[PDB]
Design a protein around this ligand. Sequence first.
Ligand code: BEF
Ligand SMILES: [Mg+2]
Lengths: 445, 142
Amino acid sequence: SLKHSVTQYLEEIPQQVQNRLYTSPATCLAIYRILPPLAKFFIMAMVFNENEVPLLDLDKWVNSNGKLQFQNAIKSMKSLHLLIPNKSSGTLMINLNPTFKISLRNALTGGEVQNSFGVVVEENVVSLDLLDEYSANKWETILHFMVGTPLAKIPSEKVLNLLKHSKLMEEVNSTGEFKITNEGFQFLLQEINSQLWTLLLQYLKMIETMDLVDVLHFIFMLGALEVGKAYKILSETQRIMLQDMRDYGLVFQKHSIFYPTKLALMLTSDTIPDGSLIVETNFKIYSYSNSPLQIAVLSLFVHLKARFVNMVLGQITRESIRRALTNGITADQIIAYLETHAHPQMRRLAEEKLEKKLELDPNCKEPLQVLPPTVVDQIRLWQLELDRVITYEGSLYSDFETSQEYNLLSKYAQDIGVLLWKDDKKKKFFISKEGNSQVLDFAKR
Amino acid sequence: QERMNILQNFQYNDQINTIFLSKVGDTSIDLPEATCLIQISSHYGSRRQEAQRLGRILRAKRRNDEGFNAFFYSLVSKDTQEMYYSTKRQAFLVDQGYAFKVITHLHGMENIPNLAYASPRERRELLQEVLLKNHPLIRKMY
Ligand code: BEF
Ligand SMILES: [Mg+2]
């Protein structure tokens, strides 16, 4: 989902902006890695030759089996306008963008780069003691404020504003408090890489009039940089952008020189367990985790009763489950969290359970259920309890002079998909408030 | 004598396979043949009686054959205090480790030829019935 999200955002950008975005080799090196392997192979083939190759020649390279992959590769490459298709002499010739070609050539052959990757001050600092602690603390503060646990040093107005203006962290002044949503829980369920990418993408969409190309220059150059080394300070917009990025725990400033941190390298590519937990038939949870973030997120749907240094023990209750559901969290997401943080003991016992099931009846390959089905049934039943009462807003139509007219109006409502209930014997029906105006207009006409 | 006859026939007679016991046989009875247990009426929230009733089928004769799993059914009406009492009477089994599975529907129920109280007419008749539920010589003279 990482590459998919980044590629989708880059695809939505206009071609005019993309052409200027491909000016710096630093951005090109990052964009190149996101494409599918076949697209990367074709791009590498095309970069080093200053000629035009027909699309049929590219098709010849792919075997019959990878013919499907060829379609996805070409579609993705054409969506970003990376390959410009020119038709002449009866042949659909394919060529690479000149700016992208020159940028890749400079990056690979060490040509002129205009210090897009930056310079080195040769004044190194202790990464483990300062960079790691700083970024870990700041990311922990933002995630703590997201999960809602009390915290002294609240995040800055920049990130707070981004959070509110985004779908994440719905807030209301009338209530005077901030609460997590379904997308918030999904964000917390996503990995560190995707967790950073989500916030960065929201910032990219939020920024208005600071150039869009400049923001990507800075982000991709930051991904290019390596942790544990100095980098002298750049664009005028990039100065304030760097100060803002310091608020996300990505780059550390003394108070003239900025230093990338572990998350800066985490942005480019990826890279007993902490968080693994045991769920008992008594609706008890024992998570072998020592982290306030994990404790707070567990508190969303667990009625915590106590804690130890090595683990956290809690009990599942209707109140906690209803709290989590009211926050918009889906039972599927909850079970996904539990399954991906299942203990090795639970996984081994579930593997033995599946082995016993298949040994008893190997004809049917039953699904692997890590946790007892009763908990899943109870959670889904509580969701059904919340969904028991169903209500709609609208108006009721009755007192129809003619059955033909009644049927005409009801059928029109059904056709436009705003009909919720009808009764021919009573010649009555109900329509949604959304379709009320359309039904009234049709009745008048 | 009659209850012993019932038990002996339910045990050794091929014709009979199901019986309807009550609170009398809740505890301290050995039934090596009993395998399936069903509860339609329960004595309120009694957690001890829950376990004692379950104890009857824990000594089934064919309790060691591969793939065997005894069954314990608890019928409860939803949206009633029967659910309150049912959830209160299983807090000891849950503590021991037994987990109850909620069965919303039994597949293939409609294909049975005849079902008791299947007609609304019989439903109305049963409704009314259940509602209506609530001198030695003078010795010859006499
Ligand atoms: F007498 Be036993 F506990 F059935
Ligand atoms: Mg005894």
